[PDB]
Write a protein that binds this ligand. Structure first.
Ligand SMILES: [Zn+2]
Lengths: 522, 50, 50
DNA sequence: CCATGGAGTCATTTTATCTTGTGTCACTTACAGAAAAAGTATTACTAATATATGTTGAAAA
């Protein structure tokens, strides 16, 4: 880094031969450092919590027999997730859990989320939930895609038996590999298909090991095991090659995972479909959910369970929702012609029975849609490519999660190619995203076509206009069946008699604490 | 102690053996013993003599 | 590496500081048996004997 | 005015204490809990999907 004060030399050799330890450059001869001086031999809220995280960290660390390495690897991840304050209010285990998890995931080792929970009584969902959430609140790479080819190692460890298993290992490995190739690996919980491979190669090596004995380490269901098994029995060249020579046949034949096979069971140019549309409407006035709960055909009210009232209808088969403050959510609407229509109709009970409750602030909170491309999709490389915009977790849920910001919609993906799409307030955004991503679909295929026009049907505001936007037009759009959806006074007398009949314990402690309000000053 | 942090918070009915935490809690007996026999500093507080 | 990693790497983990260990001795010697193995915590372990 | 009693000062021991103890290589390995704040998990809804899971049981051998 320094320079010879004479030759202006750019490179130095230390000289360790004669125990001078010189430092001199080939073109100068002038030293630079002679005499190589060489050495020898509290209370904070955040830092304390970091120490505690170390302790709960070490604790769970060796318990799974993980590297001393990977722990201090993941401890940093905890320190990172603290910055976005994701870790503040959620059960500490679920945090330290995934924070420890993604690390040994990136290193590509054998550890497993289902395996990871049983340190607790908890569900391999709560942990999975928190995990997948800290995937949102951080931004994480694609790399942690596990295969059975890793897990079959450690699963083989507790199988007892003898040296033959190593043989079985290679017997299993190339098996599972072809199984990944034969195309009926995708979208499944890996540990299961791993155990299936082990049962196969073990039987291939002619031993007797029971299914229970397999799932003990495999941590899957017997039924699942033999279901994935019998799924293997009918596969390509399964019968013909099942004898000796192991497999020298790498030939794939055809590829037919049960995903679209069931599409045959019930058996661009295809338009995405509208399942449901969620909206909101404000009535501008607060009412008594108890009082409204008295006369309705579709009602249920249990603040002990949920603080609001159920509202529904038979046609156009919509639920929506109602609040206490006088606002509401809109559900069950397959289109907009049904929504503002129904949205107004649910106010006809009220303006017929309850308060003034006009129709205000009507906006779609979300739109649901789904469709199918009618051909298989390989997700394992999809996210491995697009996981910047995508995520794929075999364990939780079968399909792939896709994140599109432009426009902003999450795309739910499967093996068969059936695609569910929502997280959109606008019908056009659907065909936008579906359109733009469909070339990615055509990109990943194994061996309609024409988008036609990007926008065909009328816009959303057209169908919003097909229903009266004026908050005071109701009796005109009243189905006249809601005139029959009012129950008589006696049905409210004895029906309320039943409601309070069961609710006198809930309102009991309710009004009792209302008395404790007096007890406050005392 | 580690048996208690289960039993502070009455989460449903708490049993779930509480056992499998022992592996979590182990190697104080192993690593503590290795480090001892390798280094050769025996810390005995029970006799208060090291 | 010893620095604080982040969820950002475009390409390089690359740059290396090579710190080879040298045999400083008064007399020439020979390398005979050189072992490659890995300890229980799974990290590369190299042991050579002169 | 004088012998006395009482105390005040002043040597004198004997107890309580601390610094040391030949040199050189050659490796070696601040407590805990309390309260406030932040944030979240249910707690309902469709609504599509596709595994797991259990059971069971029905149906077949
Ligand atoms: Zn120089």
């Amino acid at each position: 880094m320094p320079v010879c004060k004479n030759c202006h030399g750019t490179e130095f050799e230390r000289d360790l031969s004669n125990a001078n330890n010189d430092l001199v450059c080939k073109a100068c001869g002038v030293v630079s450092e002679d005499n190589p001086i060489v050495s020898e031999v509290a209370l904070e809220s955040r830092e304390a919590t970091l120490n505690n995280a170390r302790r709960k960290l070490r604790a769970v660390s060796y318990a799974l027999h993980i590297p001393e390495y990977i722990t201090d690897a993941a401890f940093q991840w905890y320190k990172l997730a603290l910055a976005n304050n994701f870790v503040q209010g959620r059960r500490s285990q679920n945090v330290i859990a995934s924070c420890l998890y993604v690390a040994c995931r990136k290193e590509k080792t054998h550890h497993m989320l289902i395996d990871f929970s049983s340190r607790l009584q908890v569900s391999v969902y709560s942990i999975g939930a928190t995990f997948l959430k800290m995937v949102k609140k951080l931004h994480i790479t694609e790399l942690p895609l596990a295969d059975p080819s890793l897990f079959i190692q450690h699963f083989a460890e507790k199988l007892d038996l003898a040296d033959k298993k190593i043989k079985v290992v290679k017997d299993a490995v190339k098996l599972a590999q072809r199984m990944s190739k034969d195309w009926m690996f995708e979208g499944r919980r890996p540990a299961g298909i791993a155990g299936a491979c082990i049962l196969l190669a073990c039987r291939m090596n002619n031993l007797r090991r029971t299914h229970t004995e397999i799932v003990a380490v495999s941590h899957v269901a017997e039924e699942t095991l033999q279901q994935r098994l019998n799924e293997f029995k009918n596969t390509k060249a399964a019968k013909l090659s099942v004898q000796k020579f192991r497999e020298n046949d790498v030939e794939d034949g055809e590829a037919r995972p049960p995903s679209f096979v069931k599409n045959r069971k019930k058996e661009s140019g295809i338009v995405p479909t509208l399942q449901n549309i969620v909206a909101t409407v404000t009535l501008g006035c607060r009412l008594d959910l108890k009082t409204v709960a008295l006369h309705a055909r579709n009602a249920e009210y249990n603040p002990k369970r949920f603080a609001a009232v159920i509202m529904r209808i038979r046609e156009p088969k919509t639920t929506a929702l109602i609040f206490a403050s006088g606002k509401m959510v809109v559900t069950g609407a397959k289109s907009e012609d049904d929504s503002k229509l129904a949205s107004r109709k649910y106010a006809r009970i009220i303006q017929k029975i309850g308060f003034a409750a006009k129709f205000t602030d009507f906006k779609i909170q979300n739109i649901v849609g789904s469709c199918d491309v009618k051909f298989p999709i390989r997700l394992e490389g999809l996210a491995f490519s697009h996981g910047t915009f995508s995520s794929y977790e075999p364990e939780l849920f079968p399909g792939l999660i896709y994140r599109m910001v432009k426009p902003k919609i999450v795309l739910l993906i499967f093996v068969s190619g059936k695609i569910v799409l929502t997280g959109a307030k606008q019908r056009e955004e659907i065909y936008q995203a579906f359109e733009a991503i469909y070339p990615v679909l055509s990109e990943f295929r194994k061996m309609s076509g024409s988008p036609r026009n990007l926008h065909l049907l009328p816009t959303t505001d057209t169908y919003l206009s097909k229903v009266s936007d004026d908050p005071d037009n109701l009796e005109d759009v009243d189905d006249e069946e809601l005139n029959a959806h009012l129950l008589n006074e006696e049905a409210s007398k004895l029906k309320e008699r039943i409601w309070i009949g069961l609710n006198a314990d809930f309102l009991l402690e309710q009004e009792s604490k209302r008395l404790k309000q007096e007890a406050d000053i005392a | 102690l580690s048996i208690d942090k289960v039993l502070k918070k009455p989460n449903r009915a708490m049993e779930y053996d509480a056992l499998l935490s022992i592996n979590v809690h182990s190697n104080n007996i192993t690593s503590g013993l290795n480090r001892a026999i390798s280094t050769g500093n025996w810390s005995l507080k029970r006799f208060k003599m090291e | 590496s010893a620095d604080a990693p982040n969820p950002n790497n475009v390409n390089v983990q690359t740059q290396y500081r090579e710190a080879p260990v040298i045999y400083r001795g008064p007399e020439p010697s020979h390398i005979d048996q050189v072992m490659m193995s890995v300890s229980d915590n799974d990290q590369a372990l190299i042991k050579v004997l002169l």
